[PDB]
Symmetry: C8
Subunit: 214 residues, 8 copies
């Protein structure tokens, strides 16, 4: 299911009309917003769509021992891969960082202080930019997009090395707990299915009793 989740997240980002309020202060709270909030939403949706969550909540409510811990630490990892993809693609595109850290790039060396902040804030994604002064247009876009793509590649490498270090090592892979978990997960589904079966059967008998009065 997580595959359709990743594809849906990428396609949804392909359908989000990004645009920056070219204002001196609200930028830092919009780029980071688009960068962080949809990850949180997808990370919670990773818990909504799962089925074991009800059982785990019910068992954690009443005050086995560690198999619950493994189930939880496995569901978290299973759900964590959607926000990673979202952050990855939205850093590789670059519009987010261009929107966020536009009012801070060093104009003095690399490429009214309040008015300076105003213009540099107007820098990204606009044809309302003052223009030549203190920066060109395409230069401040290319610099920020390079920084963004570098952060994106570094982050993807970090997430991938964590994923590689988790699927080989110690974090709750002792075979006993694994077997107990698989047994529990099979038993719950078998119980639901067989209850549905016997319920349907008893209901069929009752309905045959009731119908034939006419």
């Amino acid at each position: 299911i997580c595959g359709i989740m990743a594809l849906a997240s990428a396609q949804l980002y392909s359908a989000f009309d990004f645009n920056c309020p070219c204002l001196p202060r609200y930028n830092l709270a919009y780029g980071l917003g688009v960068l962080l909030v949809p990850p949180l939403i997808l990370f919670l949706l990773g818990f909504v769509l799962n089925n074991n969550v009800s059982m785990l909540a019910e068992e954690w409510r009443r005050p086995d021992a560690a198999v619950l811990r493994y189930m939880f630490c496995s569901m978290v990892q299973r759900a964590m891969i959607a926000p990673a993809v979202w952050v990855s693609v939205t850093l590789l595109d670059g519009k987010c960082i261009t929107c966020a850290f536009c009012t801070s790039l060093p104009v003095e060396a690399l490429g009214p202080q309040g008015e300076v902040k105003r213009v540099l804030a107007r820098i990204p994604c606009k044809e309302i930019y003052d223009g030549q002064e203190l920066i060109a247009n395409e230069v401040a876009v290319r610099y920020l997009r390079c920084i963004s793509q570098a952060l994106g590649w570094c982050f993807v490498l970090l997430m991938t090395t964590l994923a590689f270090l988790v699927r080989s090592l110690r974090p709750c892979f002792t075979q006993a707990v694994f077997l107990k978990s698989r047994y529990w997960s099979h038993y719950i589904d078998i119980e639901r299915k067989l209850f549905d079966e016997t319920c349907a059967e008893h209901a069929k008998s009752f309905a045959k009793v009731c119908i034939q009065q006419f």
Copy 2:
């Protein structure tokens, strides 16, 4: 079925020709209209297309005990997910809030009083805007669209956290009522099917009796 409902709602919004009556007063009653009425229509259609509704209405007409309450509080949740999607996408696009709260943005600081209201009302989605005075064009569009997308993300987060808090907690999940509900829902369908079967059989016998006179 709710999946095809969500896809149909999104595609229908993709086929609704939005446009704003650039008038001083009717805006507040058009943006909010497009924002609120189609949600109500979809929320009622969530009850039309369902089948249990007839049984629930019939049982509630005559003056078990709580299983009806669970069936109702489950059907409501099942139907609630179409208006959420509609409001989400129509806030993320931004045309609705741009249409509604255009005659109120502070022109004095951020970016004839009656004439002022008239022009600021003409602001959105038009090439009939007065232009330079008291605001640019793209600035008042970007500001309002940023506000709209922020509200949209906040709302999606709110609906998702409610959905996550409901599918794990107390609101009528005691196993007894759940089992009674599943039993009832299986019995109704089995009754309808078996009645159809025996009716077809008796009819076949009667028809074989009637036909062979020729």
Copy 3:
């Protein structure tokens, strides 16, 4: 079958080349025409394509008791959903009302009397409009299209609340008549099928008798 009917009605409206005779009087009789006549045609086609209609007509010709009434009041509802969709989409597009009530909008306040009627009649869907005088062009289009879409949303809400109030309440849902109707509808089809079967068999025997003379 009604689903393909709704899709066909919408697609047919997508293939009807609308255009307004920019004349002082014929408008009111063209917008309303396109709005009302195709609904009537689709509502009658809802009776043509149905099969029970022959039986109902035959039984109503000779001067059970109420099961006919239920069959009729059910077929009417089954057929009513095509004109609703047609009126809905042709009000949401807006060209119909723009064509109809163009010669009446108040030019004095909101946005030769005979010549005035002539021009305001020429208003919609034309590049032959006089222009600046007494109205702009895009303003009288936007105002009328807003009115049209408001009427459309109100109408869709009205039809949907009627549909929701019918599929839960009193109008001939007493189980006895429902069962009698289902029995009748199964018996008619079973009779036709079995008559076809026995007829084919007797014909096969006769044909085997006739053929083998050569």
Copy 4:
């Protein structure tokens, strides 16, 4: 089969390159031509592609009683639905009436007499129109297309109400003739099939006799 016939007729009209000989007299004999002749061709093709036609012709050649009449009055109705669709779409498009009744619209009030006829004949579908004199261009097109679409809607309503009045009423629906017709139609096909079967069998025997000399 009639469904593919209707779709083929509509698609063929979508592939007929209409154009008007802008001449004073030949118009009336070209619009009406395109309007009437292809209906006749399709109405005859409705008899070619049918199979019962041979039997009916053979039985009518020699000088039961009324079952032939029902078969004929049913085949006619079955074939009549292609020209209806053709006339419907070619009136809704409007080019036919624009081509035909262009040399007659009243130029004096609504919107050398011989030269007048010549120009008004040149009116439709041309950029060789004289222009301003006695009419505009788009006005005489819109007026005629409105008239055409009105005739088209009226005609579709007429054909549909006839179709609804036929499939419920008296015209040869007495069950005896209907049963005789169905019996005859099953017997003919069964005879052909079984003759083919026995012929193939006898031929197989003969061929096995002949082949094995080598």
Copy 5:
């Protein structure tokens, strides 16, 4: 098979790059060429692709009685429907007649004699036309295309009425010859199939004898 033949003929005409040698005399021998030769080619290909042709030729070589005549008069009709479609579409498009009878239309009344012939020959499908003199450009195109489409409709009606008059009437439909023909056509195929079967079997035996020496 004739259906794929008709579709292939139409699509091939959709892929034939028509162009007229704007010369005084060769026109009459190019329009008629494109009009007549491909019909002959398709009419012969209707005999190539058929299988009965070999048998009929073989039986006609040596100097039953009339069943051969029916087989021939049926194969001819079966093959005749490709050139009809070709001529139909290539008259409805109109380029053929425009190319052929361009050097003959009456320039004097309706719309150096040698030079006149030269120009009128240059009339069709060219931007090298002299222009205003003695004719316009679009007028002589529209007139000829109208004539062509009229001939096309008349021809399609003629072919269709012949097809309708043949599939109901006298031309060799006496049941005896029909049955003999069907018997012959089944016997030939059964003979070929069964010979192939027994040949394969004897060959399998021989090959099993030969192979197992190794």
Copy 6:
């Protein structure tokens, strides 16, 4: 297989970037090249892809009687239909003859001698043509393309009448040789298949013997 061969040849011609070396002498050796060499390549590929060729070569190497002759005269005909299609389409397009016989058309009557040859050689497929002198541009293109398409139609008619005259007449159709050929062609395939079968079986036994030492 020959169908996919014809389609592949046509599509390959649709992917051959034709262009003419506008030189006085090399033309005659380029048009004819593109016209003749790919036919030879396809005619040899008709022998490569066939399977009987090995058997026929092997039997012809050693110095029955006439069945080999029939197999050969049948394989040749089977392979001959690809170059026919290639020549047909590459004559109907016309670029080949336009490229070849461009330096020969009579400029004097119909439409430095060395310089004349040079220009007329430059005529086709170029915007480097001298222009007005002794010929226009589109005239010498249309004349040559008409000649090419006439040759193409004549050639297609010739090949089709040969194909029709071969599939009905004398060239080695005596039933004895035909039967011997079919028998031989079945026996070869049956031998190969059954040898493969018995070989696989003996190998399976041997492998089961060898494997189970471990």
Copy 7:
């Protein structure tokens, strides 16, 4: 699985918006970055998605003999083919080397020193290039892209000859270790499957015991 990995890597490179920070020093650390880091990420993902990795890690943790070595040296080769494809396509496109070694090409012979470095750094992928001085634009692009494609072809040849030299020669192909590896790989999967089977069965028994109290 590696096929979908190669296709996904190529398509992902088709969706990476490359762009160069036209700066004097950061180039060398951006071209090489895009060239080297995604290969490392894909090479680690080649270990994540594989299943044997857990077993190999577990066995290597505790301090047979060489079969582990073969499994490892086979998994490495299996995973190595994604970075090869990535480097291949991103060298054949050429943007990487154009971005990296742009500040070094010899301007003096082939095609303020600090300012020279600045301009030559600005060379690639920009319309902000100084222009004529010391180099053209398209020349320094073509030269670098030729160098890049030459390196790409050389690298693809190198990787392919290594792949050909490995799949024929000595590196741990002794049949004993190969058989032991295949046995181990079959046994692990069979163990997992059969454990799942017996676990499901015991769970079904337990659930049937538990359910039927109601």
Copy 8:
């Protein structure tokens, strides 16, 4: 498999961005490079993807008799058909020879010596060509592309006649070696399959022994 190889090679050539370093000397080493190296890579990949190669290498390592020779001379022919297709299409397009032999065409007769070499080297695929001097632009392109396509057709004919001369004649087609080869190729696959089977079975037994301790 070789079919997908040919299609992949052609499509890959459709995705190789060709471009010429317009330099006096490197051309001869770039056209020939693109012409020759990818053929070598594909010819080696024809050995990588094959499976028999391991067996042949293993048997050739230790110092039957001639069946190995036939297997080798068959695998070589099987793999040789990808570079043929590559060279064919990359000669028919013409860019390769245009890139290679551009600095050599005789400018004196047909169409500073160092500067002459420089310009003629700049000739192909550039809009940086000096222009009129000593050659036009399109002429030197057409001449070289004609030469290239002539070489391409000659080469395709050569490869096809070799392929036709090999699949009919002497090169190791004696039936004994062919049968031995087919036997060997069946035995190897049967051995691998049956070993896998028995290994899976023994492993299943062992795993059933091990699992049921819990």
